[PDB]
Design a binder for this molecule. Structure first.
Ligand SMILES: CC(=O)N[C@H]1[C@@H](O[C@H]2[C@@H](O)[C@@H](CO)O[C@H](O)[C@@H]2O[C@@H]2O[C@@H](C)[C@@H](O)[C@@H](O)[C@@H]2O)O[C@H](CO)[C@H](O)[C@@H]1O
Ligand SMILES: CC(=O)N[C@H]1[C@@H](O[C@H]2[C@@H](O)[C@@H](CO)O[C@H](O)[C@@H]2O[C@@H]2O[C@@H](C)[C@@H](O)[C@@H](O)[C@@H]2O)O[C@H](CO)[C@H](O)[C@@H]1O
Lengths: 307, 307
């Protein structure tokens, strides 16, 4: 079998696979109070994309299409198009368009538009509430709240570029976004389909290891923590390499090339997530040049040295 | 020598190295009316980053620091920090902080901020004019025009996330941005330093081959074309692989795995740019699964089959 590898990029050189921001740190914690089932940043070690995962680090939480104004408001409905501006196909066997947000929250950014005829352009602050009834990306429609009642034109290509998240400051602080709560991609009382599975540690004394970023906050008191299971660069790497998994777990060592010593070891499960031997919440302290290295194929219940 | 390779990702699976948006197409044209000296997306084939190039696809045209309000306006001065929020060091031998915009234009996005004490947040539309006298990123300072006169706090971490570009619609359409005009990183009448060199075809009948995207337009009639010399994924790949160049030019073939036939060939110069045998402006038509493949090391003046 073709030898398996992970990139040698450091954590801070890599990108969150769930929102277009750099990775900041590694974090581990118990995950019993939630279901860890993100749909972006999902890929097997042999390169099979899962859920709503696609390859672009900058086509995550974006939308494209044309918009229609909702009378008596600053709200616009976007009829979704594909990345190359073609009609959206709701019958593809995916949960929602690839790159669709995979958490319930209020994502703020800019809605921009070009008029084809003369190249005139416009841009307005906009928010999408992924927990709202009109959030139906699998059906081909989402709604944005904006700062205009009349500037956007119909039947002109329109893009949403995400920036960060908001919260209602008159309610309990940090109560949203909820990063581990999937939206209902087809709206209220319709089940999600074609999902990447939930993940959890399976061996005693282990926890998931998360690749963590802090989303920009744009209003209120949001929970800005965002954990992904794989860096976007790992998704791109496995997709290209397509090296076969020789067991259920790739043992990785995290090495400091400065001192030449292994800092810790972890399990990269072939379905695309990482666990470590630790109990409790912990922000890992790592050197800037630290990187992960594949060392060997082991079994699911291999006993790791404590992190 | 370690074998040289380029990624097998397709054009549409890759990212512009000069602005955080996907690649759309390949473009070639004559470049005599301009100096092609971009500072982002610059890397040798053996993995040496040049100019202001860094590794993150989502740390391009971003800024971070703290802000001070300019009385009697909606303008804020940002005192720049590093990616990990440390003091900026102007003595590093680079043209400007890595990821600094490398063109003269008006870049619009959102300026966001978190108050450390309570986690309160705020976000406002903001524009940076990279041709303006206060655009002095190499000195550690840039100015933003915003939509607020009082909401941003002092001595709190503040981020700018870029979205697109604007133009003054009362002046000649598409006269800005000017993608091939470098800002003056230390301001008026101070020479830029430590630049990646300008590039140009050197063999008769050749033109640069550009990796092209369309920036979102946020107001007016901007020129939204943006050409990079290398995809960001190629920068990341060469940085990791560090395969030695065995001649001045890596001959690449662009292959359609569908039909099994080579579509065209091109030269990847070891200093990190591509040329093709063509005269005239041309949007290349390529199949979605088309990709580049390294075939052999050749000399600078190797004669390519016409594109
Ligand atoms: C759209 C607008 O006019 N924004 C103002 C407004 O912003 C408020 C407002 O949107 C309320 C709505 O419930 O939500 C927040 O209170 C928001 O303020 C934002 O969040 C608070 C916690 C602070 O961090 C604040 O600085 C931030 O802007 O009023 C505020 C001033 O209170 C600003 O004037 C916005 O521009
Ligand atoms: C900030 C604001 O109030 N924006 C309005 C305004 O926007 C104008 C204005 O900013 C002028 C300043 O010289 O620049 C443009 O004209 C801009 O309009 C934008 O560009 C034109 C070419 C159109 O594409 C327009 O749709 C776009 O918004 O007025 C416009 C209406 O003319 C909107 O009301 C903005 O919200």
């Amino acid at each position: 079998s073709k030898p398996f590898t992970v990139p040698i990029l450091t954590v801070e050189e890599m990108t969150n696979s769930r929102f277009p921001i750099p990775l900041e740190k590694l974090f581990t914690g118990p995950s019993g109070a939630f279901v860890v089932q993100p749909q972006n940043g999902r890929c097997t070690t042999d390169g099979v994309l899962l859920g709503t995962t696609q390859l672009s680090p900058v086509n995550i939480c974006t939308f494209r299409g044309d918009v229609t104004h909702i009378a008596g408001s600053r709200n616009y409905t976007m009829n979704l198009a594909s990345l190359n501006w073609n009609n959206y196909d709701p019958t593809e066997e995916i949960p929602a368009p690839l790159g669709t947000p995979d958490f319930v929250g209020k994502i703020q950014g800019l809605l921009t538009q070009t008029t084809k005829g003369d190249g005139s352009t416009r841009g307005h602050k906009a928010t999408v509430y992924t927990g709202s009834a009109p959030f139906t990306p699998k059906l081909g429609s989402v709604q944005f709240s904006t700062d205009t009642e009349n500037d956007f034109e119909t039947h002109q290509n329109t893009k949403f570029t995400p920036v960060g998240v908001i919260q209602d400051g008159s309610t309990t602080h940090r109560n949203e976004p909820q990063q581990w709560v999937l939206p209902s991609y087809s709206g209220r009382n319709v089940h999600n389909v074609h999902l990447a599975p939930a993940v959890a540690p399976t061996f005693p004394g282990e926890q998931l290891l998360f690749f963590r970023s802090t989303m920009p906050g744009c209003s209120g008191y949001p929970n800005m923590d965002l954990d992904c299971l794989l860096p976007q660069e790992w998704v791109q790497h496995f997709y290209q390499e397509a090296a076969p998994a020789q067991s259920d777990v790739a043992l990785l060592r995290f090495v400091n090339p400065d001192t030449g010593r292994v800092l810790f070891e972890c399990k990269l499960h072939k379905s695309g997530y990482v666990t470590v031997a630790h109990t409790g919440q912990h922000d890992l302290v790592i050197p800037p040049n630290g990187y992960f290295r594949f060392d060997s194929w082991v079994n699911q219940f291999y006993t790791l040295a404590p992190m």
